[PDB]
Target: cytochrome C2
Amino acid sequence: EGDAAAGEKVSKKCLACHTFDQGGANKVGPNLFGVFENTAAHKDNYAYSESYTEMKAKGLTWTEANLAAYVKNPKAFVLEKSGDPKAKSKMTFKLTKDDEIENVIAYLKTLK
Ligand code: HEM
Model:
């Protein structure tokens, strides 16, 4: 689902905190090239909130459906999927429009 060309547009909403290119810098949040189908806490050089390390132990991978639920409300996400009530997220920013989420995901799928 999802037009990865409208997705690239929406993605401009993430660029204050993230980069997209291969080898890219960790600005505020980790670079997101390669994120699709990859583990939670997927970048080794970024210091993630403990809650992402605990999704990653569980074997959570960034599927279409877990990116969908995440980018709707990261903080509810990380509580939910970690099982740790004291779960923190530094993200905070959410997408609320369904078309947007679907399109953004379709454009994450083209970055490896
Ligand atoms: C639609 C726009 C964005 C998308 C697609 C995006 C996607 C994601 C993804 C998939 C992760 C987790 C990667 C991992 O588990 O390895 C993440 C982490 C994070 N994002 Fe974003 N994000 C977006 C916008 C933002 C913006 C606007 C901010 C800052 C205001 C930001 C800050 C962060 C931070 C700080 C983390 C790490 C969280 C922590 O360890 O607590 N993100 N992002």
Q: What stands out?
A: Residues 98-108 form the longest helix (11 residues). The pocket of protoporphyrin IX containing FE is lined by residues 13-14, 16-18, 28-30, 32, 35, 40-43, 48-49, 52, 62, 71, 89-93, 95, 104 (CB under 6 Å). The chain has one domain: 1-112.
